[PDB]
Amino acid sequence: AQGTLIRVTPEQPTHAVCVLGTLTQLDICSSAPEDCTSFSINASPGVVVDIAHGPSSTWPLDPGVEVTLTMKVASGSTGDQKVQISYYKALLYLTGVEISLCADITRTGKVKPTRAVKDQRTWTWGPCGQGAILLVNCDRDDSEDLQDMSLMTLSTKTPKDFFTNHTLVLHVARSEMDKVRVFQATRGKLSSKCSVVLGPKWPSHYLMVPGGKHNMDFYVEALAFPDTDFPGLITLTISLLDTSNLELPEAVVFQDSVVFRVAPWIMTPNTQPPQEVYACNEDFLKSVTTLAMKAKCKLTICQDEMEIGYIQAPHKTLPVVFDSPVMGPDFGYVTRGGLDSFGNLEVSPPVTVRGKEYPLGRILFGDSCYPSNDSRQMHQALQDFLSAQQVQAPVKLYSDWLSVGHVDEFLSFVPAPDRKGFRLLLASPRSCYKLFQEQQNEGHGEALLFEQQKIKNILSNKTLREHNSFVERCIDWNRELLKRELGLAESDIIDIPQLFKLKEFSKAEAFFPNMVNMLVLGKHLGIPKPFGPVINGRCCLEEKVCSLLEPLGLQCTFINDGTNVRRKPFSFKWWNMVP
Amino acid sequence: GTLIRVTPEQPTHAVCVLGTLTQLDICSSAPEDCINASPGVVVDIAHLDPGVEVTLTMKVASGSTGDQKVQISYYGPKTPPVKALLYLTGVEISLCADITRTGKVKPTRAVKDQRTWTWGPCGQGAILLVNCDLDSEDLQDMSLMTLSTKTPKDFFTNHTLVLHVARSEMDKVRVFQATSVVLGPKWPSHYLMVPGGKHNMDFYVEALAFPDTDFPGLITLTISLLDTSNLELPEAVVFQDSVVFRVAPWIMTPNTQPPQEVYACSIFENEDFLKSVTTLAMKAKCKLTICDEMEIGYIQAPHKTLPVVFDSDFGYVTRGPQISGLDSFGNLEVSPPVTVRGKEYPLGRILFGDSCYPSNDSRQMHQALQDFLSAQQVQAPVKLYSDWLSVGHVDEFLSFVPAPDRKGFRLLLASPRSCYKLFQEQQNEGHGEALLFEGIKQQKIKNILSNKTLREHNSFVERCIDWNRELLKRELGLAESDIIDIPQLFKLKEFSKAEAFFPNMVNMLVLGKHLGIPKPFGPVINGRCCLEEKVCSLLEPLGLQCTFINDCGTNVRRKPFSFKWWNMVP
Separation of alpha carbons B99 and B111, rounded Å: 10
| Catalytic residue of the set B395, B419, B464, B530 | B395
Can you give A294-330 as a three-state secondary structure string?
Answer: CCCCEEEECCCCEEEEEEECCCCEEEEEEECCCCCCC
CB contact under 8 A, A480 and B164: no
List all residues 6 or more positions away from A443 whose beta carbon is below 8 Å from its beta carbon: none
**Pairing mode of beta strands A204-207, A196-198:** unpaired
Residues 30-89 of B with CB under 8 A from A: 51, 53
B67 marked ligand binding residue: no
- Please give the backbone phi and psi of residue A543, each rounded to the nearest 5 degrees, phi first: -105, -40
The residue among A242, A211, A208 whose CA lies nearest residue A76 is: A211
Q: Mapping DSSP to helix (H, G, I), strand (E, B) and coil, where does residue B158 land?
A: coil
Query: A77 near A159, Cβ under 8 Å?
Result: yes
B138 marked ligand binding residue: yes
List all residues 6 or more positions away from A53 whose beta carbon is below 8 Å from its beta carbon: A59, A64, A65, A66
Separation of alpha carbons B536 and B530, rounded Å: 10
Separation of alpha carbons A361 and A346, rounded Å: 10
Q: Mapping DSSP to helix (H, G, I), strand (E, B) and coil, where does residue B565 land?
A: helix
Q: What single DSSP character describes residue B54?
A: E
Name the packing angle between helices A541-549 and A431-441 (round to 10°). Answer: 120
List all residues 6 or more positions away from B82 whose beta carbon is below 8 Å from its beta carbon: B8, B31, B73, B74, B76
List all residues 6 or more positions away from A308 whose beta carbon is below 8 Å from its beta carbon: A268, A319, A320, A321, A564, A565, A566, A567
What sections of B409-530 are H helices per DSSP?
Answer: 416-427, 445-450, 454-476
Query: A516 near A525, Cβ under 8 Å?
Result: no
- Positive or negative, the CA dihedral B100, B104, B110, B114 is positive
Q: What single DSSP character describes residue B396?
A: G
List all residues 6 or more positions away from B238 whose beta carbon is below 8 Å from its beta carbon: B15, B17, B159, B225, B226, B227
Nearest to B188 among A173, A371, A470 (CB): A371
Write out the DSSP string of A49-84. Answer: E--B-------B--TT-B-BEEE-S--SSTT-EEEE
Can you give B70-105 as a three-state secondary structure string?
Answer: EEEEECCCCCCCEEEEEEEEEEEEEEECCCCCCCCC
Question: What's the number of CA atoms in the CB half-sphere (13 Å) around residue B179?
Answer: 5
Pairs from B458-463 (Cβ < 8 Å, separation ≥ 24): B458/B416, B458/B420, B458/B489, B458/B490, B460/A248, B460/A249, B460/A251, B460/B492, B461/B388, B461/B416, B461/B490, B461/B492, B461/B498, B462/B415, B462/B416, B462/B417, B463/A242, B463/A251
**Pairing mode of beta strands A152-157, A196-198:** unpaired
Nearest to A171 among B224, B357, B417 (CB): B357
Separation of alpha carbons A166 and B4, rounded Å: 79
Residues of B in contact with A370 (CB under 8 A): 162, 164, 189, 224, 226, 237
**Residue A413: in which H helix or E strand, if any?**
strand A411-415
CB contact under 8 A, A490 and B51: yes
CB atoms within 10 A of CB B45: 9
The residue among B73, B307, B93, B264 whose CA lies nearest residue B192 is: B93
Separation of alpha carbons A343 and B278, rounded Å: 72
Q: Mapping DSSP to helix (H, G, I), strand (E, B) and coil, where does residue B442 land?
A: coil
**Pairing mode of beta strands A90-102, A14-19:** parallel
Residues of B in contact with A376 (CB under 8 A): none
Backbone conformation region of residue A36, classed left if phi is above 0, alpha if psi is from -120 to 50, else beta:
left
Write out the DSSP string of A368-398. Answer: -SS--TT-----HHHHHHHHHSTTS-EEEEE
CB contact under 8 A, A248 and B496: yes
**Pairing mode of beta strands A524-528, A557-559:** parallel
Q: How were these coordinates obtained?
A: cryo-EM
The residue among A512, A22, A205, A531 whose CA lies nearest residue B360 is: A205
The residue among A122, A116, A74, A67 whose CA lies nearest residue A94 is: A74
The alpha carbon of B566 is separated from its chain's Cα centroid by a whole number of angstroms, namely 8
How close B466 gets to chain A, by Cα (Å)?
A: 7
- Please give the backbone phi and psi of residue B374, each rounded to the nearest 5 degrees, phi first: -90, -20
A27 touches chain B (CB under 8 A): yes
Separation of alpha carbons B397 and B420, rounded Å: 17
Q: Which residues of A81-113 are buried (b: 16+ CB within 10 A; e: fewer)?
A: bbbbbebeebbbebbbbebbbbbbbbbeeeebe
- Positive or negative, the CA dihedral B121, B124, B130, B131 is positive
Which residues are registered as beta bridge partners of A207?
A168
Query: B460 near A251, Cβ under 8 Å?
Result: yes
Q: What single DSSP character describes residue B139?
A: S
Separation of alpha carbons B180 and B204, rounded Å: 10
B367 touches chain A (CB under 8 A): yes
Pairs from A111-115 (Cβ < 8 Å, separation ≥ 24): A111/A151, A111/A153, A114/A256, A114/A258
Residues of A in contact with B25 (CB under 8 A): 490
DSSP 3-state percent helix, strand, coil across chain B (nearest 5): 15, 35, 50
Tell me the residue length of chain A.
Answer: 579
Residue A365 amino acid letter: F
Has B154 been annotated as catalytic?
A: no
Query: A548 near A431, Cβ under 8 Å?
Result: no
List all residues 6 or more positions away from B215 whose beta carbon is below 8 Å from its beta carbon: B172, B209, B247, B375
- Please give the backbone phi and psi of residue B281, each rounded to the nearest 5 degrees, phi first: -60, -30
A502 touches chain B (CB under 8 A): yes
Separation of alpha carbons A461 and A5, rounded Å: 91
Q: Mapping DSSP to helix (H, G, I), strand (E, B) and coil, where does residue A178 land?
A: helix
Known binding site: residues of A?
137, 139, 141, 145, 148, 303, 305, 307, 323-324, 330, 342, 345-346
Residues of B in contact with A466 (CB under 8 A): 230, 233
> Which residue ranges form the domains of chain A, and what is each CATH number?
1-98 (2.60.40.1860), 103-262 (2.60.40.1700), 274-576 (3.75.10.10)
User: What is the signed CA dihedral for B93, B141, B191, B198, rounded to 10 degrees?
Assistant: -30
List all residues 6 or more positions away from A87 whose beta carbon is below 8 Å from its beta carbon: A10, A32, A33, A36, A39
Which residues are registered as beta bridge partners of A261?
A133, A233
Q: Mapping DSSP to helix (H, G, I), strand (E, B) and coil, where does residue B534 land?
A: helix
Separation of alpha carbons B501 and B498, rounded Å: 9
Separation of alpha carbons A542 and A534, rounded Å: 9
Residues 152-191 of A with CB under 8 A from B: 169, 171-175
The residue among A116, A129, A40 whose CA lies nearest residue A84 is: A40
List all residues 6 or more positions away from A16 whose beta carbon is below 8 Å from its beta carbon: A4, A6, A24, A92, A93, A94, A95
Write out the DSSP string of B34-50. Answer: --EE-TTEEEEE----T
Pairs from A530-536 (Cβ < 8 Å, separation ≥ 24): A530/A558, A531/A449, A531/A450, A531/A451, A532/A449, A532/A450, A533/A439, A533/A444, A533/A447, A533/A448, A533/A449, A533/A455, A534/A447, A534/A448, A534/A451, A535/A439, A535/A442, A535/A444, A535/A447
Which residues are registered as beta bridge partners of A567?
A274
Count of pairs with CB atoms under 8 A, one residue in A, one in B: 107
Q: Mapping DSSP to helix (H, G, I), strand (E, B) and coil, where does residue A481 land?
A: helix
CB contact under 8 A, B457 and A248: yes
Write out the DSSP string of A121-172. Answer: S----SSS---EEE-B------HHHHTT---EEEEEE--TTGGGSEEEEEEE
Query: A513 near A561, Cβ under 8 Å?
Result: yes
The alpha carbon of B398 is separated from its chain's Cα centroid by a whole number of angstroms, namely 25
Backbone conformation region of residue A410, classed left if phi is above 0, alpha if psi is from -120 to 50, else beta:
alpha
Residues 240-269 of B with CB under 8 A from A: 240
List all residues 6 or more positions away from A492 whose beta carbon is below 8 Å from its beta carbon: A419, A420, A422, A423, A424
- Residue B40, classified by CB atoms within 10 Å of its CB into exposed (0-12), middle (13-18) or buried (19+), is middle
List all residues 6 or more positions away from A63 whose beta carbon is below 8 Å from its beta carbon: A29, B481
Residues of A in contact with B164 (CB under 8 A): 370-371
CB contact under 8 A, A174 and B357: no
How close B225 gets to chain A, by Cα (Å)?
A: 10
Separation of alpha carbons B559 and A72, rounded Å: 52
Query: A384 near A336, Cβ under 8 Å?
Result: no
Residue B148 amino acid letter: S
Residues of A in contact with B224 (CB under 8 A): 369-370
How close A181 gets to chain B, by Cα (Å)?
A: 16
B470 marked ligand binding residue: no
Query: A166 near A241, Cβ under 8 Å?
Result: yes
The alpha carbon of A517 is separated from its chain's Cα centroid by a whole number of angstroms, namely 28
Nearest to B357 among A30, A239, A484 (CB): A239
Q: What single DSSP character describes residue B31?
A: S
B213 touches chain A (CB under 8 A): yes
List all residues 6 or more positions away from A491 whose beta carbon is below 8 Å from its beta carbon: A419, B51
Residue A266 amino acid letter: I
Separation of alpha carbons A270 and A265, rounded Å: 17
Q: Mapping DSSP to helix (H, G, I), strand (E, B) and coil, where does residue B173 land?
A: strand
B333 marked ligand binding residue: yes
Which residues are registered as beta bridge partners of A520?
A525
Residue A285 amino acid letter: L
Residues 387-406 of B with CB under 8 A from A: 388
Query: B348 near B254, Cβ under 8 Å?
Result: yes
Q: Mapping DSSP to helix (H, G, I), strand (E, B) and coil, where does residue B437 land?
A: coil
Write out the DSSP string of A253-301. Answer: EEEEEEEEEE---B---TTS-EEEEEE--HHHHHHHHHHHHTTT-EEEE
Which residues are registered as beta bridge partners of A219?
A183
User: What is the signed CA dihedral for B229, B235, B236, B242, rounded to 10 degrees?
Assistant: 100
Query: A276 near A297, Cβ under 8 Å?
Result: yes
C-alpha distances in angstroms, A61 versus A38, A352, B485? Answer: 6, 62, 20
Interface test with B, best of A370, A419, A431, A466 (most B CBs within 10 A): A370
Residues 450-489 of A with CB under 8 A from B: 466-467, 469-470, 473-474, 476-477, 479-480, 483-484
Separation of alpha carbons A29 and A8, rounded Å: 9
Separation of alpha carbons A502 and A513, rounded Å: 15
- Please give the backbone phi and psi of residue B342, each rounded to the nearest 5 degrees, phi first: 95, -50
Backbone conformation region of residue A417, classed left if phi is above 0, alpha if psi is from -120 to 50, else beta:
alpha
Task: Compute chain B's Rg from CA coordinates.
Answer: 35
**Pairing mode of beta strands A394-398, B409-415:** unpaired
Separation of alpha carbons A313 and A109, rounded Å: 9
Which residues are registered as beta bridge partners of A39?
none
Task: Give catalytic residues of A, as residue numbers.
Answer: 304, 406, 408
Residues of B in contact with A401 (CB under 8 A): 234
Resolution (A): 3.6
Residues of A in contact with B457 (CB under 8 A): 248
Q: In chain A, what's the furthest Cα-to-Cα distance?
A: 119
Q: Mapping DSSP to helix (H, G, I), strand (E, B) and coil, where does residue A464 land?
A: helix
Separation of alpha carbons B341 and B320, rounded Å: 31
Separation of alpha carbons A417 and A415, rounded Å: 7
| Catalytic residue of the set B393, B419, B457, B551 | B393
C-alpha distances in angstroms, B141 versus B130, B146, B299? Answer: 9, 16, 11
Query: A201 near A244, Cβ under 8 Å?
Result: no
Residues 297-326 of B with CB under 8 A from A: none
- Residue A128, classified by CB atoms within 10 Å of its CB into exposed (0-12), middle (13-18) or buried (19+), is exposed
Separation of alpha carbons B115 and B241, rounded Å: 8
